[PDB]
Amino acid sequence: NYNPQTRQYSGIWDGTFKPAYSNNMAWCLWDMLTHPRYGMGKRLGAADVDKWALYVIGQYCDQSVPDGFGGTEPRITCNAYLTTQRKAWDVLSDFCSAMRCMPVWNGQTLTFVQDRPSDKTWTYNRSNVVMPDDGAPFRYSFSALKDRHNAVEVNWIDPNNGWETATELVEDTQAIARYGRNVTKMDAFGCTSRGQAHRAGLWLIKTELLETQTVDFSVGAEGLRHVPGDVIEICDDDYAGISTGGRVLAVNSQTRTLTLDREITLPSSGTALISLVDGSGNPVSVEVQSVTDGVKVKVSRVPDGVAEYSVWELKLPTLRQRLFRCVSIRENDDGTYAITAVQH
Amino acid sequence: MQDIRQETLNECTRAEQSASVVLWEIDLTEVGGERYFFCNEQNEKGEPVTWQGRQYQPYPIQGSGFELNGKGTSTRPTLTVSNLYGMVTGMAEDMQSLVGGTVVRRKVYARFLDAVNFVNGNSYADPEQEVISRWRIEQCSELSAVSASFVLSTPTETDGAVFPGRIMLANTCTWTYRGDECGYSGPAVADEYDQPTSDITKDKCSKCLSGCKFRNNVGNFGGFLSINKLSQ
Amino acid sequence: MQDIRQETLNECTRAEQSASVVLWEIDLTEVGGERYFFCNEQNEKGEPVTWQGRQYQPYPIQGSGFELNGKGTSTRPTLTVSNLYGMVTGMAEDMQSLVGGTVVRRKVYARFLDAVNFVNGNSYADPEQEVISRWRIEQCSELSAVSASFVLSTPTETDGAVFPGRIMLANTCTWTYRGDECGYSGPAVADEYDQPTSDITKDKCSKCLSGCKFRNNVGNFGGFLSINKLSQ
Amino acid sequence: IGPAALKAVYDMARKGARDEIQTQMRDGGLFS
Amino acid sequence: IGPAALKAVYDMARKGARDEIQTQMRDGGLFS
Amino acid sequence: IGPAALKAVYDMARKGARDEIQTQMRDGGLFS
Amino acid sequence: MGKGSSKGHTPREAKDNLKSTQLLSVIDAISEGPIEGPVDGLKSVLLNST
Amino acid sequence: MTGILFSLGASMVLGGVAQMLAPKARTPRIQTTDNGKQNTYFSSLDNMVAQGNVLPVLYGEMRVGSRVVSQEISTADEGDGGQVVVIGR
Amino acid sequence: MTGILFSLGASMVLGGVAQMLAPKARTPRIQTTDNGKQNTYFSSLDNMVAQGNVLPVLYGEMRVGSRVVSQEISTADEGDGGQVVVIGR
Amino acid sequence: MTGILFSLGASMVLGGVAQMLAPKARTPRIQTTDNGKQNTYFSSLDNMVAQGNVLPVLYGEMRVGSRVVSQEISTADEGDGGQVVVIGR
Ligand code: SF4
């Protein structure tokens, strides 16, 4: 479907390829991984790499983004002339550093996980996760002072001023007042545009200013669904200070009342939605109407087959969601899975 | 997310669950051997465990260390299997240490297992529910009279690979003989020592200019002649 | 040698001594918060320990690993404080992980502690006797429902620093806006995208030549123009 | 207390080794 | 259980250290 | 024998790690 | 011109006296696979920097 | 089938949050012969020797300098390819 | 609040007694392009390029060569600055 | 007089079977100033500076370029060593 000149897609892809010249970075990486005579085609077949994730990465790479001069340019375009002989890992982590995707081996195929906005997958409250002997279900750790970079110098070759390399400085003035100045040097791979180098530096500065928290916890017997790159929400009662998660003790369909595990208080001037797990197995949000004795609620409708001891979550409008992004899932002998995440 | 079937997720959610069975399959087709099926337990009737039609055999085998992390080095799980009776020795002397074959692992809840296993049958049998993952044997860390331990690895590993990979040589051809790039298909001509021959079994190119001239295929020569004059 | 007072040394050399009290003060003034005082125990009367007029609060806090060695890497001591009731979480969401603030540690013998603490009073009270050391919070290695653990560091650490540190750039100014070297002090002129404005809140230099020309301050330009012609 | 103690000590030794390498990497250490 | 436990733990620690260094040297590790 | 054994084993592991790194630093080792 | 192969030339000025001229013959190996070619014909070929 | 399980968050974050989401790009080593001229791994503007080196790969529009396979100097022929040739004035 | 205490003396003297009282000075890497010329980190006598490099610091009396900010060639004016201008013989 | 004894076969083989029977030869670092010229540690064909460098050792028949101890330019004497010398035509 791809049209290299106009960078436009026609319809739904069918899994077939055609030969053409393009600047797209995703298909440059695909050519790197799976070409027989010079690339890595003999070790790594075409079935081991998933062409379906590279499709959406290529779509993300071709969107129109403003440049400084007032025009519009694609985000990422591969312009490279590779002359020296390096390790395959170095070239792979130079191709995956420009489009900011981490190459992780899924169970069956090698997949690429990119950093673009995404929606939540599953919610883990204090009842879903394993309680260690210490007594702390979640353990949060933060980034260091000197690891929060503020100024980056990016090298890129200049088509206009002769193809000699030129450096650009990206800075954050507000962050420097707080954390001091932490300077870093970086190279932009396949860069021949000033806007792309500036965005490459700005991504580091913003991701190290904004996302500074990680969490580690264990989830038992239902971690089969998770692979690296999933985005999950954490509802920690101790962190928030208010009860937001539990399990259902009894359901009454005729009166539409749920007896919860612990007492809850309705917020003032708002509507609270209680998440429920349907008999089919997909979350179904329903709007809370009243709480009788703290334990009992009165939902608008009761989803079909809400069994006893099923996870429920309270979604207040005031509180902000706490999303996370998995980076490792260590299978354990006890049948539990240890999950590590970084703020999203 | 892996596209796990709905019934498997419902089984994962429940408080009281059925047994979890891991079904190992060792594939040696690429190397030149046959595919072997093993499982850790027998069924309830004292027979090999039957999943679909495979009928995995009982044999002490354990695999530990599997993980899903891309931040650091590769995963490198470990698989341990016993050879008290000398099976692993027989496979390793013959198929060159079982290095290069595939290992496929399936996790199926005992609830969906085939109805042949249980004496009273299973009404919930469903052969589509499983979780599959493929690895490739890398090394045989130990081999003894008690047990034998292999270390697996991902099919896509980048340890010995360099990207451009093609060398410009002055006197030696880098192509593979009779391959796609050499493009030669004809009668056997010479030996690997540039000695004339006609038997097809012992026809090999010497990767030299004379060896290529035997084929009159000088046009497709891999190397670039007379570079050493300039490099000097 | 530290200038320890004579009474403290006399207490050190004795055979039977009084209790040694460590008093912790966490300073968040530079970050923008308030200073917090903690101590590990209550006094003999069941009240907060009063040293000078500070009245350090009782709270489970411990710091271990302090050292004085310049041969190898830096010291990096550790400080552990509990947050069963969520105090540390409240301080960390608000003041950005308490990273950059100061920690000051005082060791005072219970003999010289103030007279308010002891029910019968203290005749030897002397507020001058203490040993002080300063550190800066570096990281929060853990934060859970049971405890919170920080790692301190020396104020003079050389991890992310390079000495010269001034880059000659062809198109970008490295000074700070309205700083000492830029030397601009006047009405708001432009935005960070070289758009005209008059609000003083959103007056920012774009570090570009046009952004500097808005100020008519080209003379003090940080960068050096037309270098890329020679570098080419 | 049997081989389980040996396995636990091996895991702790590996963790200590990683921590020591990361400590030595920074300024002033052997690897710097 | 006496100093013999300390000696055994030291030997296991050294083995773990060698294993960790060799693991780190390969592609993607700290030393690569 | 409680967490104290874990802490002692961790300290011994760190000592072993330093010793092993210094041993491998000299001629013939991995780091040479 | 064509994609698979191409040719171009700029004519040489005629001589006046009876003198011979040297000739430099160079072959360069640009890249590996099928590449699309020059962007603007002979203008994309630069000797020294002209 | 036993051991101790640790938490990797503090160990992972030690480098930086960015490195957990995307690897880091490589920078060539510095040589003082260049007088501060800075190099990159994906561009090369000069003609290099051939033997023992790899054949490069070009992925996008760019100015290229290429490895030399042949180079010689000889005497040029007077004929310009046409039937008519005129020598001298 | 427990552990084992070790002795550092045999570990500290493994490098040398001199390194225990004062750090060691750094030596630049050797490059064969110089034909055996030896460099140091506190001297440079040649003019280097400007962009992307730091502005140097000079701490004592020394001969210096410095990064170039401008360089051009043009035709010179005949006037020497005085009122009287004489051109030719 | 106690401890645990391990097996070294898997650790020794980890690099390769060849290194167990014979060490590996060293390769000089790559510099881009050479335009891809490849160097080795046992040959040098050019004249190098003398001070601060070692006096080389030659072990077999080979072309050599050697460190310079002296170099000067002066005017040459007319006498060729014989008793008779003739200047000019
Ligand atoms: S030398 Fe000629 S015949 Fe032999 S492999 Fe090379 S191209 Fe083919």
Ligand code: SF4
């Ligand atoms: S560009 Fe001009 S006004 Fe802006 S910071 Fe630099 S010197 Fe000051």
